[PDB]
């Protein structure tokens, strides 16, 4: 059924995360992928959220079935894979969710998301105002996330059949290596579309 898309807004996403049971991470705008601009992002970068025009035993994955829920799927992919480094609040919406769906397939997890009314309600507390029907019915932008897991950069998109493993990284190269990927695999492919957005996930 029909959800309102989330805006790539650092404040909203942080408040949404707190309310889900994660207050230890925050979001920061990326102005560009050149070293000059990446240098200003505080370290350690834990993930990159990216909005753009539309053997993994160790990674947490969820399939997307609700077309405009992709922003929420990104936050699940983010916190589900940072669960060890940044633990969720006990008895929170996400603590409950992650425990419930831990032995489920990515498909079945995705379908438990459809039934989770707490999450749908919170998504729509923090999705940011729309003006017209097209804001909700005509969505041309995808919302995905890049994480580092066992020293590799992993792209998480619930519309795909599996996580996408990109490359190796170690130390604080993550942001810079993720930038190369983004520029090469996504931005370069798009001529004359400017509608891209990126956020760095850093400790709060």
């Amino acid at each position: 059924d029909i959800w309102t898309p989330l805006e790539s807004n650092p404040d909203s996403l942080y408040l949404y995360s707190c309310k889900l049971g994660q207050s230890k991470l925050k979001f920061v705008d990326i102005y560009g992928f050149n070293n000059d601009l990446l240098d200003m992002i505080p370290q350690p970068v834990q993930a990159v959220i990216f909005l753009y025009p539309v053997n993994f035993d160790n990674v947490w994955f969820i399939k997307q079935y609700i077309p405009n829920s992709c922003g929420t799927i990104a936050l699940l992919h983010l916190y589900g894979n940072l669960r060890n480094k940044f633990e969720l609040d006990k008895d929170s919406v996400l603590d409950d969710f992650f425990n419930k769906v831990n032995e489920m397939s990515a498909e079945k997890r995705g379908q438990e998301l459809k039934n989770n009314k707490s999450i749908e309600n919170l998504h729509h507390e923090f999705c940011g105002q729309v003006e017209n029907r097209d804001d909700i019915l005509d969505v041309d932008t995808h919302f995905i996330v890049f994480v580092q897991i066992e020293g590799k950069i992993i792209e998480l998109d619930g519309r795909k059949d599996h996580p996408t493993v990109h490359c190796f990284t170690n130390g604080d190269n993550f942001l810079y290596d993720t930038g190369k990927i983004i520029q090469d695999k996504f931005i370069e492919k798009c001529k004359d579309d400017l509608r891209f957005s990126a956020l760095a996930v850093i400790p709060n």
Binding site: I30, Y31, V139, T141, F196
Partner: protein, 75 residues
């Protein structure tokens, strides 16, 4: 005067402006040029987000200054 606006994709937009132009006017010029509605646009200069009601003069943005454009997109 001329100012430049850099996007995330690395494109540079050239705009024709006066010191008396407001940040709203500048956003409207970017829409004329690129079709992006002003409400989705955030302009940064010197690491400071520029406020809609102020002028380029208020921020002492001079000739050939480069701004960064961040887009608030719905995904």
């Amino acid at each position: 005067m001329q100012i430049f606006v850099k996007t995330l994709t690395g494109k540079t937009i050239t705009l024709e402006v006066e010191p008396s132009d407001t940040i709203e006017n500048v956003k409207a010029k970017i829409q004329d040029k690129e079709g992006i509605p002003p409400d989705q646009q955030r302009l940064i200069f010197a690491g400071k987000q520029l406020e809609d009601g102020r002028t380029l003069s208020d921020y002492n943005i001079q000739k050939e200054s480069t701004l960064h454009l961040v887009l608030r997109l719905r995904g």
